[PDB]
Design an enzyme around this catalytic site. Structure first.
Site, PDB file in Angstrom:
ATOM      1  CB  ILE A 138      -7.858   2.802  10.071  1.00 16.30           C
ATOM      2  CG1 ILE A 138      -6.984   2.625   8.821  1.00 16.30           C
ATOM      3  CG2 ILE A 138      -6.915   3.509  10.800  1.00 16.30           C
ATOM      4  CD1 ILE A 138      -7.115   3.823   7.735  1.00 16.30           C
ATOM      5  CG  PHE A 170       0.244  10.163   5.335  1.00 16.01           C
ATOM      6  CD1 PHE A 170       0.651   8.563   5.799  1.00 16.01           C
ATOM      7  CD2 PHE A 170      -0.891  10.242   4.880  1.00 16.01           C
ATOM      8  CE1 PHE A 170      -0.819   7.826   6.622  1.00 16.01           C
ATOM      9  CE2 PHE A 170      -1.322   9.293   4.652  1.00 16.01           C
ATOM     10  CZ  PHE A 170      -1.742   7.890   5.145  1.00 16.01           C
ATOM     11  CG  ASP A 171       2.958   4.855   5.937  1.00 20.35           C
ATOM     12  OD1 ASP A 171       4.295   3.821   5.372  1.00 20.35           O
ATOM     13  OD2 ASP A 171       2.938   3.699   6.506  1.00 20.35           O
ATOM     14  CE1 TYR A 193      -4.542   5.856  13.316  1.00 21.26           C
ATOM     15  CE2 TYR A 193      -4.845   6.993  10.677  1.00 21.26           C
ATOM     16  CZ  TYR A 193      -4.032   5.821  11.208  1.00 21.26           C
ATOM     17  OH  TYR A 193      -2.886   5.339  11.577  1.00 21.26           O
ATOM     18  CG  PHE A 204      -4.754   3.831   2.475  1.00 25.17           C
ATOM     19  CD1 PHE A 204      -3.516   4.010   2.406  1.00 25.17           C
ATOM     20  CD2 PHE A 204      -5.452   4.392   2.670  1.00 25.17           C
ATOM     21  CE1 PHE A 204      -3.156   4.150   4.021  1.00 25.17           C
ATOM     22  CE2 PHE A 204      -5.827   4.785   4.602  1.00 25.17           C
ATOM     23  CZ  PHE A 204      -3.817   5.129   4.529  1.00 25.17           C
ATOM     24  CE1 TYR A 232       1.052  -0.328   4.455  1.00 22.96           C
ATOM     25  CE2 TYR A 232       0.674   1.937   4.110  1.00 22.96           C
ATOM     26  CZ  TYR A 232       1.235   1.143   4.904  1.00 22.96           C
ATOM     27  OH  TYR A 232       1.227   0.989   5.427  1.00 22.96           O
TER      28      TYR A 232
END
Lengths: 145, 688, 107, 296, 48
Positions: free
Chosen positions: C56, C36-37, C82, C99, C26
């Site tokens: 999540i 961010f990731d 979140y 995502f 992902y």
């Protein structure tokens, strides 16, 4: 005595406003005098732990003046000298203070001295402040701006 | 824009370098939560690319190297470095197999840092980063990074740097030799301390450092380098000297195990034949320490007459002492680490005037270590301890908890660290080893660390203070040696046991009282200055109302019976030991008390004031009237408890009967003073 | 809720069942475009098992609808990603997340 | 006394290690100080200082560093002991040969600033007793043995040019902190040993007065007058009166100790030992006063 | 992997290797002089 002189000269927002009460001939030195006053205060407080500890009671006095357009560098230098010496001020520094410093970065641009001040806010004499580290991380990193 | 443009855009280069400095500041000193947050901004691929980027400016290359060290390795390295000063050697067959010299009086020296080490060291713990897991507390672990790949990359990069330095290229990587070598040497030193490198990797590093000496090209030791590189080389050689010392300690423990086994078998056989005269039977009716002192007192040939040990065993011990001296290089082109270090340091000092005081201190400390090896082992033996293999898991758990506590010495106190400290103490007290091996615990020095933590907090954390006090009280109650150790800090506790005892739990005054119970030697060693200090505190307590009670709205009275009682019971334990009265302290305390009569409270004050019975009746009326009692402490009971404690103390200060019959003038004088202070009729009235 | 935009078709027959371990790659980015990731930078597929509140909600709701080999975009609203508190230092409050998810294997 | 072979193995091994270290390792003698100093004193292939000189300059730097209290450093203690032990180590010919060898060994130190380092470290300690000051005093005695005139001149010149009072303030504080006998402590000890200290710093007192005696050895009138009065300094301290004050306190303690044992016919070993050490200190003080007043 | 197909104008379309608008890797549709198509989106003015 120097603090009293600064407070009484700070009640005027600009040279023209000071000219409305003291005249133009007196107003052309208002900015020079205030800059010299801050420079003397910095020389008077650099390197004295007792003197830096004296500011643990009136830190908001220094922080609230950071947004002034005149003597910005001198006031920042005064804050840096206080913070690099007195661990008590780090124990009294709060979130509104840190947000004010970050807004100083936002409004006056990319100045490395503000970054050095934030670095100094974290650890003093080999001991770190978790609250300060967390507040800086929360209020500075995630924006990515 | 390409990041390589910062070589000419200096304003942005400086700003980004200070940004990296701020990243290190925010994640400094164990803030793993921030380290995880920083992993979302500076990821592994960027860090690894930056390590190999040969066109990066020096300040940026150093900044990224330090950021990687701060994020991933600093906490583990610091905890391991803290644990490296102790030598807990289990009695395992691998330990048994350890020898000073390889099998292949003195033989060829082995390679430093290569071999089998059995000293206990807790393993490192890491957690994989992730920013999609459900948000949940237990302390977060450091992010995990591939260590085998990192160490292989570091070795390859260092070898390439060494080759380029040999070539003397006019365009060094990073703009200077310092910027080319210092980050790599820092990374290698950190990985060496963490112990990631294997035997082959250490051999390769030793070959690059000195290919000729460490043989079973040109080295770093003969190339002209700056002071920072010389400092890193000193750190490396310090590490290898520590490894040599640990090897000597483990070999000595293995020989101790074998020789003790032979001694026990021989003594058993001698006793067996002896069972079929005081000189013959004296050995077996003596303490084991004296038995082994007599057994080992045969070093000189002028006293080898009383020793019953066989000559073959004596020869075995002398052979081991000889090969120990040879391993320490005491005489009975360099070819050993000691000569290499001495030659390099002397050459460096006589080639130029060193300007770095840190480098000067490092090189002279290393030289002193090489010249004085036996003394270093002598000063390191007190921290060596052998344990049974069945207590390894408990010892490792105890070391983990002690490492957590030591990691809490460099962080400002908070509620979370308080909870971690409390649970660590509970886990320590839940371990049987803490009670089975008290000498090891003293060598670990937990009580010094706890006292230092307590004074650092000094009330904001009463649960923490009472947890530390209970720990030290338990520590004193384990053994007399612990009590003697804590008696040396009696004055240190008293000076901090001022007003603010807390109305919560055990206090430093309670630990001090618990440290003198049932010990005549310490009671007689109790200084007079401590007693005057305590009486002065009680006098101060006897003149002002309790500030906490006043802040709680209790009616105002001009003294503090609770505090006075707390000091009174301390003097009771100081003056009454093992059921008998210590007259030296009793006389000193009584004389101080009469010299300060205001310590007796509103009653017995003189120049106006009713007796003990009147005071008790007034207290009873206060108790019966709720308005005068409360705004939980009841003033009537506190007053009665105070006077009861005072009368108990004066009664326990009384001279002994054998002294009264001996007619000692001082004893008669003391009894007369006590009788004058306390009338008999008041006693009967109170009893009635 | 969660919206699914397919980018590469999957097998379309084998769907994640209860108890199976899904192994995916992902990349998680904000709505403003800032990344961010990403697991690909770590060069390690992320593994999780279905129905055990390990991730999540939106992430597992999207992955449950994906077939073996499929590549898809998942959009997650603040009310499930979140919530109001966000993630300290990484994700600001009320952030809608994007995502890029590829379902590599199951069990 | 349960036999040793019935004890557990690990405990017996620990006792073996303590016994071995106490009986075999410390007793070994290894003299390396002379070889180390010789190696450090050689240059090879404005003259930049040799390694020993740089070491001394480093310690003078940390002694001159302005800090409220000097931290303890084992490295300095170790090298101070090495330097002191490397300087001392019958017919007329070899008596003179010994004096010349002693002078050469002292020259290797006092030609590299050791005297100034000693004075600076003493002024830095500010009168706080400990291992640092004891090592400094031992080094000063080692480099001053035989009343070297050159060292006396260097110390006097350095003191007169610096005009610092810390040195004599520290000396006065140390003399005020020197301990004497204590009958209450002796009685407490007697009870403690009956259940089944006194003048602990006697060696420090002896070396302090040996150092003061060596400062005036050889009838150095200039150094005797400087001790009596410091003209250039802002304040003056009379060491002679402080010495008399300590002598008076010691005399009163000796008188009390004699009356305590006068009635009893037999005097025990501990009393004899305390008398012997008190007499040794009184002897040293009398010798120091004699060196103060000779010349005359 | 980046892959776009389309038309570009002679004047103004000068993509240099390396940096550029937004994040580097400028191709067809990253300016107003080109019009691309990657199979799923229409790219123009650096907007998908």
């Amino acid at each position: 005595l120097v603090l009293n002189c600064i407070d009484r000269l700070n009640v005027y927002t600009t040279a023209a406003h000071f000219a409305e009460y003291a005249g133009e001939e007196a107003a052309e030195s208002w900015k020079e005098i205030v800059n010299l006053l801050y420079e003397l205060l910095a020389s008077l407080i650099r390197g004295n732990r007792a003197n830096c500890a004296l500011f643990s009671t009136n830190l908001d006095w220094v922080v609230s003046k950071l947004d002034r357009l005149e003597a910005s560098s001198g006031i920042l230098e005064v804050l840096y000298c206080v913070l690099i010496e007195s661990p008590e001020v780090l124990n009294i520094i709060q979130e509104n203070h840190i947000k004010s410093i970050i807004s100083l970065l936002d409004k006056h641009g990319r100045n490395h001295k503000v970054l050095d001040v934030l670095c100094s806010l974290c650890v003093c004499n080999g001991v770190a402040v978790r609250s300060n580290q967390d507040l800086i991380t929360e209020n500075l990193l995630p924006g990515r701006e | 824009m390409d990041i390589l443009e910062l070589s000419e855009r200096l304003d942005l280069q400086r700003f980004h370098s200070h940004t990296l400095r701020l990243y290190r500041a925010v994640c400094a000193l164990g803030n793993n939560r921030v380290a995880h947050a920083l992993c979302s901004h500076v990821d592994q691929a960027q860090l690894l690319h930056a390590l190999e980027d040969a066109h990066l400016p020096g300040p940026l290359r150093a900044g990224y190297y330090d950021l990687l060290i701060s994020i991933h390795l600093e906490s583990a390295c610091r905890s391991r470095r803290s644990m490296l000063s102790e030598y807990i050697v289990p009695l395992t067959p691998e330990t048994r197999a350890i020898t000073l010299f390889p099998p292949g009086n003195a033989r060829r020296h082995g390679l430093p840092g290569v071999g089998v080490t059995t000293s206990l060291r807790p393993p490192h713990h890491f957690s994989p980063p992730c920013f999609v897991a459900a948000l949940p507390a237990p302390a977060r672990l450091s992010p995990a990074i591939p260590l085998e790949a990192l160490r292989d990359k570091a070795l390859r990069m260092l070898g390439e740097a060494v080759r380029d330095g040999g070539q003397h290229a006019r365009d060094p990587v990073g703009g200077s030799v310092e910027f080319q070598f210092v980050p790599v040497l820092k990374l290698v030193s950190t990985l060496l301390v963490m112990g990631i490198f294997g035997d082959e990797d250490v051999k390769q590093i030793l070959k690059m450092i000195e290919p000729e000496v460490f043989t079973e090209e040109e080295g770093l030791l003969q190339m002209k380098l700056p002071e920072s590189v010389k400092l890193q080389m000193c750190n490396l050689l310090e590490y290898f000297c520590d490894q040599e010392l640990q090897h000597r300690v483990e070999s000595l423990a293995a020989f101790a195990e074998r020789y003790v086994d032979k001694l026990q078998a021989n003594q058993r056989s001698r006793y067996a034949l002896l069972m079929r005269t005081a000189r013959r039977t004296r050995e077996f009716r003596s303490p084991p320490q004296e038995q082994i002192n007599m057994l080992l007192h045969f070093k000189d040939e002028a006293d080898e007459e009383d020793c019953p040990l066989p000559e073959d065993i004596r020869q075995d011990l002398q052979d081991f002492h000889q090969d120990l001296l040879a391993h320490c290089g005491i005489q009975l082109k360099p070819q050993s680490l000691q000569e290499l270090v001495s030659h390099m340091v002397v050459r460096w000092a006589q080639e130029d005037y060193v300007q770095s005081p840190e480098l000067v201190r490092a090189m002279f400390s290393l030289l002193h270590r090489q010249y004085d090896g036996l003394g270093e082992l002598l000063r390191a033996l007190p921290r060596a301890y052998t344990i049974s293999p069945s207590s390894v898991e408990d010892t490792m758990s105890l070391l983990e908890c002690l490492g957590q506590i030591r990691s809490l010495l460099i962080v400002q106190m908070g509620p979370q660290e308080e909870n971690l400290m409390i649970q660590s103490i509970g886990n320590i007290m839940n371990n049987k080893v803490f009670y089975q091996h008290p000498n090891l615990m003293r060598a670990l020095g937990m009580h010094e660390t706890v006292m230092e933590v307590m004074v650092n907090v000094l009330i904001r954390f009463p649960k923490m203070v009472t947890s530390c006090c209970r720990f030290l009280c338990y520590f004193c109650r384990i053994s007399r040696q612990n009590q003697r150790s804590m008696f040396d800090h009696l004055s240190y506790l008293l000076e901090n046991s001022g007003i603010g005892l807390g109305m919560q739990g055990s206090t430093p005054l309670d630990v001090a009282a618990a440290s003198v119970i049932d010990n005549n030697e310490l009671a007689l060693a109790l200084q007079e200055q401590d007693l005057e200090k305590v009486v002065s505190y009680l006098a101060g307590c006897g003149l002002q109302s309790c500030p906490m009670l006043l802040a709680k709205g209790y009616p105002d009275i001009g003294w503090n019976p609770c505090g006075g009682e707390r000091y009174l019971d301390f003097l009771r334990f100081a003056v009454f030991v093992n059921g008998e009265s210590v007259e030296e302290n009793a006389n000193v305390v009584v004389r101080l008390l009469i010299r300060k009569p205001e310590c007796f409270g509103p009653a017995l004050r003189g120049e106006g004031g009713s007796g003990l019975l009147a005071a008790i009746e007034e207290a009873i009326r206060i108790s019966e009237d709720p308005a005068r009692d409360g705004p939980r402490v009841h003033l009537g009971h506190a007053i009665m408890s105070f006077y009861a404690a005072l009368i108990d103390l004066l009664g326990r200060c009384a001279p002994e009967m054998h002294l009264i019959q001996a007619g000692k003038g001082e004893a008669l004088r003391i009894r007369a003073i006590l009788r004058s202070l306390v009338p008999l009729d008041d006693l009967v009235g109170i009893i009635s | 809720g969660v919206e699914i935009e397919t980018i590469s078709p999957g097998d379309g027959r084998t769907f994640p069942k209860k108890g199976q371990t899904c192994v995916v790659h992902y990349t998680g980015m904000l709505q403003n475009g800032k990344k961010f990731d990403s697991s690909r930078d770590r060069n390690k597929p992320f593994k999780f098992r279905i129905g055990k509140q390990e991730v999540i909600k939106g992430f597992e709701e999207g992955a449950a609808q994906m077939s073996l080999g499929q590549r898809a975009k998942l959009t997650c609203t603040p009310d499930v990603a979140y919530g109001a508190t966000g993630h300290p230092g990484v994700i600001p409050p009320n952030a809608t997340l994007i995502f890029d998810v590829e379902l590599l294997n199951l069990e | 006394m349960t036999p040793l072979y019935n004890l557990p193995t690990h405990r017996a091994c620990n006792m073996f290690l303590e016994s071995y270290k106490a009986a075999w390792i410390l007793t070994e003698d290894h003299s390396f100080e002379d070889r180390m100093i010789d190696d450090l004193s050689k240059a090879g292939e404005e003259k930049k200082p040799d390694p020993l000189h740089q070491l001394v300059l480093h310690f003078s730097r940390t002694a001159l560093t302005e800090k409220s209290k000097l931290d303890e450093d084992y490295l300095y203690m170790a090298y101070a002991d090495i330097m002191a032990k490397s300087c001392h180590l019958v017919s007329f010919e070899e008596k003179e040969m010994e004096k010349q060898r002693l002078l050469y060994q002292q020259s290797r130190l006092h030609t590299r600033g050791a005297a100034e380092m000693v004075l600076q470290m003493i002024s830095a300690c500010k009168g706080e007793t400990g291992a640092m000051v004891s090592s400094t005093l031992k080094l000063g005695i080692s480099i001053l043995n035989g009343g070297n005139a050159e060292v006396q001149q260097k110390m006097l010149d350095y003191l007169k040019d610096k005009k610092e009072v810390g040195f004599f303030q520290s000396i006065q504080a140390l003399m005020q902190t020197c301990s004497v006998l204590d009958l209450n402590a002796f009685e407490r000890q007697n009870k403690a040993e009956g259940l089944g200290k006194v003048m602990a710093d006697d060696e420090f007192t002896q070396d302090l007065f040996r150092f003061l005696q060596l400062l005036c050895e050889g009838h150095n009138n200039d150094f005797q007058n400087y001790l009596r009065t410091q003209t250039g300094n802002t304040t003056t301290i009379n060491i002679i009166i402080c010495t008399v004050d300590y002598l008076l306190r010691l005399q009163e303690s000796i008188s009390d100790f004699y009356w305590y044992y006068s009635g009893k016919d037999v005097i025990e070993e501990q009393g004899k030992r305390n008398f012997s050490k008190a007499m040794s200190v009184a002897k040293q003080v009398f010798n120091s006063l004699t060196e103060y007043i000779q010349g005359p | 992997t980046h892959l776009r197909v389309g038309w570009a104008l002679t004047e103004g379309y000068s993509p240099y290797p390396g940096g550029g608008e937004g994040w580097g890797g400028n191709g067809v549709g990253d300016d107003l002089y080109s019009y691309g198509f990657d199979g799923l989106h229409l790219w123009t003015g650096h907007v998908a």
